[PDB]
RNA sequence: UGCUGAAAGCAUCUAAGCACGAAACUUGCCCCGAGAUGAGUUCUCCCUGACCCUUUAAGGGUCCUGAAGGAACGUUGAAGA
RNA sequence: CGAUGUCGGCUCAUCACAUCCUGGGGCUGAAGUAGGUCCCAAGGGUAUGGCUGUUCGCCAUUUAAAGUGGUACGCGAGCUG
RNA sequence: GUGAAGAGGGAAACAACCCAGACCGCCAGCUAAGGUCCCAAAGUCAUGGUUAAGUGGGAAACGAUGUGGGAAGGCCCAGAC
């Protein structure tokens, strides 16, 4: 189904009359405009690309300006794409709103997580640590051994060790929607979404539910 | 061998269409069609069908006999029609029909719903006994096998779906 | 269904068959005699 | 002095073959012969004098025996447990074009010249191509 | 586990044919990913000026021109050795 | 033998099936729960403590289950002695 | 007998297995072991049967209406099975 692109603003709570403080991550989903519709005849698949927000006229490049002028759309801060199913049609000049999720209860949120930099093995793969005493020397947080002696005598591909941790695209599914504010262009989603405040997130209807 | 040599008589009111090796039969109950293996030859004597093993095939007589049996089943199903009865046994077990489907309560929390092909006509003269009619024999055999699988007759009390003509090797529990 | 190497006939109601290249023994009146290679 | 082949002055023709009703082991060998140029008097070990061959209806290839269920195609991804296993029917249903390619690559010599020979096989899965501009000639197996 | 069914007039799950069937397999869930050299697809933007030289060509050189865009420096980041 | 560093323990795993559980099935001297035996199946999981340097093993208490073995009786240019 | 002290071809690789004992050069020809669909040079050679297991291309006691045959024997058109 057709998803939308929003901007993360922060986390907060919402109180219910029963006495429950439900967590929520407010997502600001502005008027998401259409830039191009790709059909099965030319591109080989049914999809639609979406633009969100606004960008400086002195910063938007000439190819982007021409691509936006072909549709009749202002210059946004990025371009995203969503696949289509049977019975779903759109035009080039449409501007979808947050009201699409009025009858949607569980959604999937996709976004870039927060970069933790070069992290150790313990922090990256939840490894354990050796004893800090009893004679240990310079091996308090090292991963230890990696393989076997001369059989195979190498290191397997896919081994868990230190490296980059974060700044990657992650998807969290089956998050329950709390409220939709069409006037304020706001979506209330229970739980926690990846990425810090101000990041771009993709909210789609649940694929499995 | 002997079955293949034994001929197939087609009675009055039955129309036969033979194109290549494909065979089609029409009549009262309905229309059937079936292709045969390329190791047999079928001839029509204007009143009776005959089968012969072709050259270059080792397993010719067996295929001819199978084809003869299949054609005999087809013609008798077209003329009269095949029937099969199921005698459901067990306390709390019943059956019902809705148009072309079967509804059962075989001691399960959920009711059992079973579909039927387009050439099967079911009936439930009694709560514990059902009957089915058709033109083909393999289809009704498969339907009965599915009905039997739903509730297998146990060797202690016979509870379950069982054929009206079969027997059960019941036993007695030790002490 | 007892699976072993040597399969044979135990009663007079047993029929030795070959299915999918595997030898099987089935008796029409004794489930205990069901054998497989 | 023995005549040798020059890659610049050598000529290559376009042939089109339909793989319907023929066997892998008796078609891929002819394809490899015509790719290595063993059917021409100008054959040289170090020069690709073969002809560009297009294959049509690769999904219609006929194989005898029980190979349609017992013909496995093993390969390894590179990881410790990265071993995969398929069969002839699964390969035909998923990637039919990669059933002639494996055979021809196995039959061809291994090296840059073998890869260059393999680069000429335009294996398709239907009964039509887009290389009619080359004016190909119909060929029998 | 079966249906029909001969070789073997019967019987028979099989030799022709059909159906059910497991956390095993391929998809289905998520991520990477066209250097996939077989290097892919699509919507866009950009400069439409003249001269001579042998080796006559995927040729060499001169003047004018320097676009789209990128790079560099700086402010910097919940990005980062 | 002009040196291939050794038992056990910690971290780190990987492969196999003659499988401990989960999955499906046959027989049962299988009334049901709970069981015994056998076939397929490695996708996942497969305990904390007292004693001993100990693997092994005894005991306490859990667990759906507390597997069998190979990897130089895995792993000291990773640690321990 | 070979290697040691023996080069070369073949058995995919291979000191001892088979063929075969390198004076040197030749872009001459004939053979042995071993082979003639491709890698890789040579028969998609002819007639005759066997195999349907990829047997060929790892193995036993033992078991089976798997087939391809040979020679006999019982019962059987007063009717066998
Ligand atoms: Mg960071
Ligand atoms: Mg610890
Ligand atoms: Mg010390
Ligand atoms: Mg320290
Ligand atoms: Mg020290
Ligand atoms: Mg070491
Ligand atoms: Mg089976
Ligand atoms: Mg029968
Ligand atoms: Mg039957
Ligand atoms: Mg599960
Ligand atoms: Mg030593
Ligand atoms: Mg040394
Ligand atoms: Mg030492
Ligand atoms: Mg097993
Ligand atoms: Mg696996
Ligand atoms: Mg799976
Ligand atoms: Mg104490
Ligand atoms: Mg050790
Ligand atoms: Mg050690
Ligand atoms: Mg070392
Ligand atoms: Mg000490
Ligand atoms: Mg010596
Ligand atoms: Mg020698
Ligand atoms: Mg000598
Ligand atoms: Mg040699
Ligand atoms: Mg050898
Ligand atoms: Mg050699
Ligand atoms: Mg010669
Ligand atoms: Mg010879
Ligand atoms: Mg080579
Ligand atoms: Mg050759
Ligand atoms: Mg021949
Ligand atoms: Zn018995």
From Swiss-Prot, chain A:
Q: Which superkingdom heads the taxonomic lineage of this protein's source? A: Bacteria
Keyword Ribonucleoprotein in record: yes
Q: How is it modified after translation?
A: Methylated by PrmB.
What keywords does the record list, in alphabetical order? Methylation, Ribonucleoprotein, Ribosomal protein, RNA-binding, rRNA-binding
Pfam annotation, one family? Ribosomal_L3
Sorted alphabetically, the Gene Ontology cellular component annotations on this record are: cytoplasm; cytosol; cytosolic large ribosomal subunit
Q: Which GO terms describe its molecular function?
A: rRNA binding; structural constituent of ribosome
GO BP term, example = cytoplasmic translation
Q: Which residues carry this modification: N5-methylglutamine?
A: 150
PANTHER family, sorted: 50S RIBOSOMAL PROTEIN L3, LARGE RIBOSOMAL SUBUNIT PROTEIN UL3C
Family note: Belongs to the universal ribosomal protein uL3 family.
The record describes its quaternary structure and partners as:
Part of the 50S ribosomal subunit. Forms a cluster with proteins L14 and L19. In pull-down experiments interacts with CedA.
What does it do? One of two assembly initiator proteins, it binds directly near the 3'-end of the 23S rRNA, where it nucleates assembly of the 50S subunit.
What is this protein identified as?
Large ribosomal subunit protein uL3
Name of the gene: rplC
From Swiss-Prot, chain B:
Please name the GO terms that the record assigns under molecular function.
large ribosomal subunit rRNA binding; structural constituent of ribosome
Q: Does the keyword Secreted apply?
A: no
Transmembrane spans: none
Alphabetical GO biological process terms: cytoplasmic translation; response to antibiotic; ribosomal large subunit assembly
Q: Report which residue ranges the record marks as coiled coil.
A: none
Q: List the disulfide bonds.
A: none
Which GO CC annotations does the UniProt entry carry? cytoplasm; cytosol; cytosolic large ribosomal subunit
**Matching InterPro entries, A to Z?**
Ribosomal_uL6-like, Ribosomal_uL6-like_a/b-dom_sf, Ribosomal_uL6_a/b-dom, Ribosomal_uL6_bac-type, Ribosomal_uL6_CS
| Residues annotated with N6-acetyllysine modification | 43
The protein's UniProt keywords, in alphabetical order, are: Acetylation, Antibiotic resistance, Ribonucleoprotein, Ribosomal protein, RNA-binding, rRNA-binding
The UniProt function text for this chain reads: This protein binds directly to at least 2 domains of the 23S ribosomal RNA, thus is important in its secondary structure. It is located near the subunit interface in the base of the L7/L12 stalk, and near the tRNA binding site of the peptidyltransferase center. Gentamicin-resistant mutations in this protein affect translation fidelity.
Q: Share what the entry says about its subunit structure, partners included.
A: Part of the 50S ribosomal subunit.
Q: Cross-referenced NCBIfam families, in alphabetical order?
A: L6_bact
PANTHER family according to UniProt: 60S/50S RIBOSOMAL PROTEIN L6/L9, LARGE RIBOSOMAL SUBUNIT PROTEIN UL6M
* Entry's family note: Belongs to the universal ribosomal protein uL6 family.
HAMAP family associated with the record: Ribosomal_uL6_B (MF_01365_B)
Q: What is this protein called?
A: Large ribosomal subunit protein uL6
**What is the organism field in this record?**
Escherichia coli (strain K12)
Gene that this sequence comes from: rplF
From Swiss-Prot, chain C:
- Domain of life where this protein originates: Bacteria
Q: Which UniProt keywords apply?
A: Ribonucleoprotein, Ribosomal protein, RNA-binding, rRNA-binding
What cellular component GO annotations does this protein have?
cytoplasm; cytosolic large ribosomal subunit
**Quaternary structure?**
Part of the 50S ribosomal subunit.
Q: What function does the entry list?
A: One of the last ribosomal proteins to be assembled in the 50S subunit, it contacts a number of helices in the 23S rRNA, acting as molecular glue. The simultaneous presence of uL16 and bL36 probably triggers ObgE's GTPase activity and eventual dissociation from the mature 50S ribosomal subunit.
**Per its record, how is this protein called by name?**
Large ribosomal subunit protein bL36A
Q: Does the keyword Lyase apply?
A: no
| Transmembrane helix recorded as keyword | no
Q: Give one GO biological process term.
A: translation
Gene Ontology molecular function terms on file? rRNA binding; structural constituent of ribosome
Stated family? Belongs to the bacterial ribosomal protein bL36 family.
Origin organism lineage: Bacteria, Pseudomonadati, Pseudomonadota, Gammaproteobacteria, Enterobacterales
UniProtKB/Swiss-Prot annotation, chain D:
Gene3D superfamilies in UniProt: Ribosomal protein L13
A GO molecular function held by the record: mRNA binding
Q: Which GO terms describe its biological process?
A: cytoplasmic translation; negative regulation of translation
PROSITE patterns in the record, alphabetically? RIBOSOMAL_L13
> Which of UniProt's keywords are assigned here?
Ribonucleoprotein, Ribosomal protein
Pfam families the UniProt entry points to: Ribosomal_L13
> What does UniProt give as GO cellular component?
cytoplasm; cytosol; cytosolic large ribosomal subunit; ribosome
UniProt-listed HAMAP family:
Ribosomal_uL13
Main function: This protein is one of the early assembly proteins of the 50S ribosomal subunit, although it is not seen to bind rRNA by itself. It is important during the early stages of 50S assembly.
PANTHER family referenced in this protein's UniProt entry, alphabetically = LARGE RIBOSOMAL SUBUNIT PROTEIN UL13M, RIBOSOMAL PROTEIN L13
Family per record:
Belongs to the universal ribosomal protein uL13 family.
Assembly: Part of the 50S ribosomal subunit.
Protein name per its UniProtKB record: Large ribosomal subunit protein uL13
